[PDB]
């Protein structure tokens, strides 16, 4: 009489990790579980665990793993998932670390709005008058912000890296009493840069 031999997974990803990009569409296959059984038993595959089960589904007869709901690296960047395989007499499980790959999917968000500053008409050329800041949660170039005025102003400049606004031309209250500038904060993603606008009000105060 031969006692049952339980099945065993063969995927090499169990020895390292599995990488799934956060832009993977729901319903899409992400990998296929592979297993062997010394009795040549037909095997049934599944996923175990409350949270894992909400993100991943498994075709029972093939072991194909597919995405049950969208991933979001900015909400959860990795999962430890427990997969199962059964030969109808016993069930064995094994865990894999799943890393969620980043894509540029956030635009920058500005800090400390609203933006408004009052400056005297006699503010010298070169004077830093305001500092804008925005952040962006995506990785790498997708999270590195550049600032600009859209369009450029002949009276004010903004440092593209630091967000520091300076006067670049002598002001004249009787010509313009207030400026409404549009600040653009963009990430630097190569293929799909994302950006956000903020208003900066610059109020000129009279001397006479």
């Amino acid at each position: 009489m031969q006692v049952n031999r339980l099945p065993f997974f063969t995927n090499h990803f169990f020895d390292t990790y599995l990488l799934i990009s956060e832009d993977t569409p729901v319903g899409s296959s992400v990998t296929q579980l592979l297993a062997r059984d010394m009795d040549n038993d037909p095997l049934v595959f599944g996923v175990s665990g409350e949270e894992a089960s909400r993100f991943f589904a498994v075709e029972p007869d093939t072991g194909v793993v597919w995405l049950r709901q969208p991933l979001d690296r900015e909400t959860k960047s990795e999962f430890t998932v427990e997969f199962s395989v059964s030969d109808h007499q016993g069930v064995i499980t094994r865990k894999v670390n799943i890393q969620v790959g980043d894509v540029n999917d956030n635009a920058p968000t500005f800090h400390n709005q609203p933006y408004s500053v009052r400056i005297p008409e006699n503010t010298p050329v070169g004077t830093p008058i305001f500092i804008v800041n925005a952040t962006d949660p995506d990785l790498g170039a997708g999270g590195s912000v550049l600032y600009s005025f859209q369009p450029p102003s002949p009276f004010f400049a903004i440092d593209s890296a630091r967000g520091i606004v300076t006067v670049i031309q002598e002001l004249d209250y009787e010509v313009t009493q207030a400026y409404q500038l549009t600040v653009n904060a963009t990430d630097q993603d190569k293929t799909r840069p994302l950006s956000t606008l903020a208003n900066l009000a610059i109020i000129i105060t009279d001397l006479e």
Binding site: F8, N97, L139, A141, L146, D159, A161, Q188
Partner: protein, 238 residues
């Protein structure tokens, strides 16, 4: 033309396509100086007499990573210690940030690096006790389980992960007690529970020395580890 100065912004961006994070795997307990990332592939020149970028490490928890900014290489710093994936250290991965500062425009880009630490079969099974014992009545029916002492980590355990840390138990022939492996069996190697295989006879033999070997389940048979214990089985009359 607008954007004619965009060349100024290229330094610090990746000099490769693909996803933003750089992910690599290395074996636990790799020697000091092991290369983690051979080339970060960041645009620009760090170090030297006219650098265009500044490279440094951020969030380098416990200083496991060393950076050579000129080669853009990351290496393991493990002098005086070991990168141990098993308990009690439990280092499954190391995440650090390669901070790049563009000198011309002052922009900063962080390049995330994830180092996945692979388990090695560097631990053998260990038994909780130096030896094991069972008392069995002479009238015990053949097929009866007579020892379950390896249940709930009282037998052999192995601190490795996966199959490297799973145990199988088998009875070996004992040249000093030849009949012991014929009288007792472990039909289910995963539990190590011992079953009576032959009728006992107190008037003939009152003690058995059963040699039990625990092995782990490393993929490569020649990398498997084994440990042996003895189960002494004494018969009782009353």
């Amino acid at each position: 033309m607008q954007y004619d100065d965009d060349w100024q912004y290229e330094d610090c961006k990746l000099a490769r396509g693909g996803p933003p994070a750089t992910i690599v795997a290395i074996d636990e307990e790799s020697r000091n100086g092991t290369i983690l990332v051979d080339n970060m592939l960041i645009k620009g020149t760090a170090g030297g007499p006219d650098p265009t970028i500044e490279l440094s490490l951020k969030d380098n928890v416990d200083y496991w990573v060393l950076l050579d900014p000129v080669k853009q290489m990351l290496f393991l710093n493990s002098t005086g210690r070991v990168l141990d994936r098993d308990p009690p250290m439990n280092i499954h991965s190391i995440v650090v940030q390669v901070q790049c500062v563009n000198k011309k425009v002052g922009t900063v880009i962080y390049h995330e690096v994830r180092i996945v630490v692979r388990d090695r079969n560097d631990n053998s099974p260990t038994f909780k006790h130096e030896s094991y014992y069972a008392t069995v009545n002479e009238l015990t029916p053949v097929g009866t389980t007579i020892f379950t002492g390896f249940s709930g980590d009282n037998g052999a355990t192995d601190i490795d992960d996966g199959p490297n840390g799973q145990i199988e138990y088998v009875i070996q022939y004992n040249p000093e007690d030849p009949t012991s492996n014929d009288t007792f069996e472990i039909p289910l190697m995963l539990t190590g529970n011992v079953v009576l295989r032959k009728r006992l006879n107190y008037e003939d033999k009152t003690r058995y020395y059963v040699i039990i070997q625990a092995n782990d389940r490393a993929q490569n048979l020649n990398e498997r580890r084994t440990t042996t214990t003895t189960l002494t089985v004494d018969l009782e009359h009353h």
